[PDB]
Chain A
Amino acid sequence: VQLQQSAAELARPGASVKMSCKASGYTFTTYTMHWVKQRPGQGLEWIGYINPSSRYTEYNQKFKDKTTLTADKSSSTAYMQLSSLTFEDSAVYYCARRSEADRFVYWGQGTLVTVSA
């Protein structure tokens, strides 16, 4: 079991990106998948998760209006779309699979997002 993320991306201030996390080695619709953001000088930060079986998403109250989580059961991928990109949204984004109660046993390798002109 491992999670495989997409490549690094680059965007303009005001554009939109879309990252992915291809999960393999387990039944995709059983476990929820969470998204974590790490700015390069500070600590980790939780964004939200999506229940893949019922397509129900729940966000942190800071990223409520910018992020959009989707998934599909056929190709076993979980997507995350960032919108209205500012200079604060240039960080490393991890996908993690939540364990029994509150634990993140399996993580992705991280994608580097950066905004520039």
Chain B
Amino acid sequence: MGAQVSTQKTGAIHYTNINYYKDAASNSANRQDFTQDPGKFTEPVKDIMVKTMPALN
């Protein structure tokens, strides 16, 4: 009957949730989608520069 079983936020256990409504705009918040891609803001260069090499040839 649905019953998605996920894991709980703990430091260094399961919880259960069911959707009751027919519209996807009425669920709970996501809160557990963790994605990082910082390379588009901190290295937006065409030619890649290695860290241990000199930046200017």
Q: Do chains A and B touch in the complex (CB under 8 A)?
A: no
